[PDB]
C-alpha cells in the first residue's frame, strides 16, 4: 500500500509544490484525513472518486513527459503562479501542469495534440481557470469569450469558463476545474482552446 505523506491524491497527481513526491506497485492508497497539501489553488476535481477507485489496484506507475514546457513558442508559460500555491516564500503552481497566459498582449488558438506511443495506458490531466471578472479575463487571456475542446477516441467535451463574485479561498477568489481521461495505446487526445487552459506537462503511464 502507498503511504501519501500529508497530501491528497489530487495534490500528488497534479504535483503540488508543497507535496514532496515514491515507489510504485502498491495494493491500496492511504491518504491523510484532512491533508494540508490540498488543491493549493481553489477548485474541484471532476470524477475524483472514480479516479481513486481506479488507482487502488495498480501494477506500474511512471511519470512521463507528454508536453515539455519549452514547447510553448506562441504563449506565456512561466508567469503562471499564485500566492495560494507557495514554494519557499515565492508564488508557484502545480508542477505537472502549466498555467498559460498571454504573450505580448495576444492569445492565439491552440491546436496541439499528442498520440500515446507507449505499450501501456496513459493517464493525462488538464484544467480550466474560472476568472474573477471580465477585466481579469482580458488581463490574462485577452480574448473575452473562450472555450476548451478536449477530444479522444472515447472522449469529447467543450468547457466554457464562468465568471462570478466569489469568496476568497487560500487567498484568491478564482477557481480551477480539473479533468482526466485515459489514453489507450495508439490513440491521440486533441486539445483546442483560446484561453483559460491549464495545459498538461507530465502524464502517468499506468497499468492495473
Amino acid at each position: 500500500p502507498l503511504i501519501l505523506r500529508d497530501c491528497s491524491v489530487a495534490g500528488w497527481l497534479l504535483g503540488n509544490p508543497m507535496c514532496d513526491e515514491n515507489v510504485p506497485e502498491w495494493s491500496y492508497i492511504v491518504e491523510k484525513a484532512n491533508p494540508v497539501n490540498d488543491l493549493c489553488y481553489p477548485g474541484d476535481f471532476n470524477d475524483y472518486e472514480e479516479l481513486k477507485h481506479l488507482l487502488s489496484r495498480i501494477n506500474h506507475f511512471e511519470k512521463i513527459q507528454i508536453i515539455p514546457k519549452s514547447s510553448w513558442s506562441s504563449h506565456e508559460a512561466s508567469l503562471g503562479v499564485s500566492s495560494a500555491c507557495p514554494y519557499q516564500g515565492k508564488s508557484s503552481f502545480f508542477r505537472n501542469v502549466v498555467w498559460l497566459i498571454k504573450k505580448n498582449s495576444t492569445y492565439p488558438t491552440i491546436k496541439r495534440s499528442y498520440n500515446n506511443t507507449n505499450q501501456e495506458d496513459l493517464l493525462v490531466l488538464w484544467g480550466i481557470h474560472h476568472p474573477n471578472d471580465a477585466a481579469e479575463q482580458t488581463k490574462l487571456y485577452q480574448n473575452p469569450t473562450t472555450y476548451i475542446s478536449v477530444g479522444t477516441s472515447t472522449l469529447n467535451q467543450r468547457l466554457v469558463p464562468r465568471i462570478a463574485t466569489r469568496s476568497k479561498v487560500n487567498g484568491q477568489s478564482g477557481r480551477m476545474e480539473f479533468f482526466w481521461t485515459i489514453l489507450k495505446p495508439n490513440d491521440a487526445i486533441n486539445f483546442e482552446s483560446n484561453g483559460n487552459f491549464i495545459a498538461p506537462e507530465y502524464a502517468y503511464k499506468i497499468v492495473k
Partner: antibody
Amino acid sequence: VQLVQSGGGLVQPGGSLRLSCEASRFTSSSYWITWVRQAPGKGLEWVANIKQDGSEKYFVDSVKGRFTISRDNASNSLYLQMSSLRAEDTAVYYCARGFLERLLLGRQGAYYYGMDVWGQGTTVTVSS
Amino acid sequence: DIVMTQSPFSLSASVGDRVTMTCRASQSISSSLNWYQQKPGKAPKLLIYAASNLQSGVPSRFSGSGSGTDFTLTISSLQPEDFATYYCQQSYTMPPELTFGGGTKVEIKR
C-alpha cells in the same frame, strides 16, 4: 453591490405579507438569495433559499406551506409571500446573497455557500 | 438534519487577550463551515469561509480552523470593536437547507 429589503411591518395573525430583496446592480447570475430571520433576543435561523431567477426554492419546516415565492411579471420583482402568519414569525428578516459552488477541501467534494452581501433587515410584527 | 452547537455561551476577556470559541456539527460537513459576526443592531458579516479562509476587509486577528465535526474560531488580540455575537453556519446541505449555531457572545473586560 448592495441589497435592500422591502415589505415589512405590522400584520394581523393569519394575515399575509410580501417581502422583496432588491439587488442594486446588474447580476452576473447563478447566485442564490437567502432569507434569515431573528426573533427579538434570539439568534439567527434560516428561512429560505431562492435561486435569484426563481427556478429553485427551498423553505424551512416551520414555514412550509405558509411561505411561498410569487412573481409580478409586469415588473422585475421576486416576492417572498408570507401567509398564515402567527406570533412565532415576529422577527427581523434579513436577505443575503451567496455563491453556491462545489469545492475539493479534503478527501471528497462538497457544496460551499457563503453569504457575503447582506441587507439592512426589515422588521415583521404579528399582532392584533 | 444537521445540528450546529457552539461553546461557550458567552465569555469576558480583556483587550489584547486571545479568545477561543468552538463549533460542532452532528455529522461531518467536510470544510463547509462559515463564521459570521453580528455587532449589536447590525446585519451579520462573513468573517471565515470554508472553515479557515479569511475574507477581505476582516482583521488578521480572526483565525478559523477545523474539519469534519470540530471547528474553532480564534481572535488573536481582542479589541473593543470586536464586541459581537459570533455564529457558525453550515452549508454542507445546500441547496435544500442550511443551519446556524446558537452563537457565542464575546464581552469585553475593562
